[PDB]
Structure 1
Amino acid sequence: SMQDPIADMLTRIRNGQAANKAAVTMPSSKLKVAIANVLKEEGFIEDFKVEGDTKPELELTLKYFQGKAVVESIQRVSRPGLRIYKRKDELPKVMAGLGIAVVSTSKGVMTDRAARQAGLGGEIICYVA
């Protein structure tokens, strides 16, 4: 059955990127919206939006730079089979700091770059570059 709604959106991003799709869409959820926001805030996508009351849909507009996908790697480290937590300093570096990790802290979701200078460890969602 469905057991990871986040890996589902990330694999939709990958598969949509590889399929050259201008956008991809998902059953929305509050966490997915926050995720989509932080990766728009690091510029990995053109835009995201949500459409419809009751059942919701979250659409992601995939970014292509000249001839190619902007995201080339996206993977999620907190398997629902085993969660992952890191201290404020133990927040990892993606592509030696070129890339991003996503941290759910007790003051919300943010990039590892934000989280380490904010002094908060937390749970780690995923890596992207």
Structure 2
Amino acid sequence: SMQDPIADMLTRIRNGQAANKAAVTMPSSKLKVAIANVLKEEGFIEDFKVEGDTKPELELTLKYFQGKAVVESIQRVSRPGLRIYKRKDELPKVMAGLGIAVVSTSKGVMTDRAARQAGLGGEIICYVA
């Protein structure tokens, strides 16, 4: 009954990419906006919006490189039934480094490479390959 909106955001992205929808809109949130910022800077998603005040909607523009999706596989790792925190040296390497692993660290939500650069780990939100 909607017990992981982060996974719902991820599966919305996945379904939209599979259905070749240009945009995907969802109930926005601060964590969702952080993750979408991470994806937009890392190149897996086009620009996005957080429009709306009393019931905000997050509108993400999806990317298609040739005719195929850019987001290959976006997998939720730390689901609310099993939380997964990793140390600095234990942070994963999705697709042997050429994919990202969005992780929430004390200095905000950042990718695996960024968390390793900053020397701290956290809660592994998701694997975006």
Give the TM-score range, shorter chain: over 0.9
Residue 25 (structure 1) aligns with? 25
CA distance, structure 2, for counterparts of residue 113 and residue 107 of structure 1: 14
Secondary structure (helix, strand or coil) at the match of 1:64 reads coil
Secondary structure (helix, strand or coil) at the match of 1:39 reads helix
Gaps of 5+ in 1: none
Which has more strand, going by share of residues?
A: 1
- Cα-to-partner distance string for 1:25-64 (whole Å, 9 max, x where unaligned): 1100000000000010101011110111111000000000
* Paired residues for 1:48-127 under 5 Å: 48-127=48-127
CA distance, structure 2, for counterparts of residue 82 and residue 67 of structure 1: 36
Secondary structure (helix, strand or coil) at the match of 2:50 reads strand
TM-score scaled by length of structure 2: 0.98
Gaps of 5+ in 2: none
Q: CA RMSD in A?
A: 0.6
CA distance, structure 1, for counterparts of residue 32 and residue 52 of structure 2: 16
Residue 15 (structure 2) aligns with? 15
Number of residue equivalences:
129
Q: CA deviation at 1:24?
A: 0.4
Secondary structure (helix, strand or coil) at the match of 1:126 reads strand
Structure 1 residue ranges (4+ consecutive) displaced by more than 4 angstroms after TM superposition: none
Q: CA deviation at 1:85?
A: 0.3
Secondary structure (helix, strand or coil) at the match of 1:89 reads helix
CA distance, structure 1, for counterparts of residue 66 and residue 108 of structure 2: 34
CA distance, structure 2, for counterparts of residue 99 and residue 27 of structure 1: 26
Equivalent pairs: percent with the same residue? Answer: 100
Q: CA deviation at 1:93?
A: 0.3
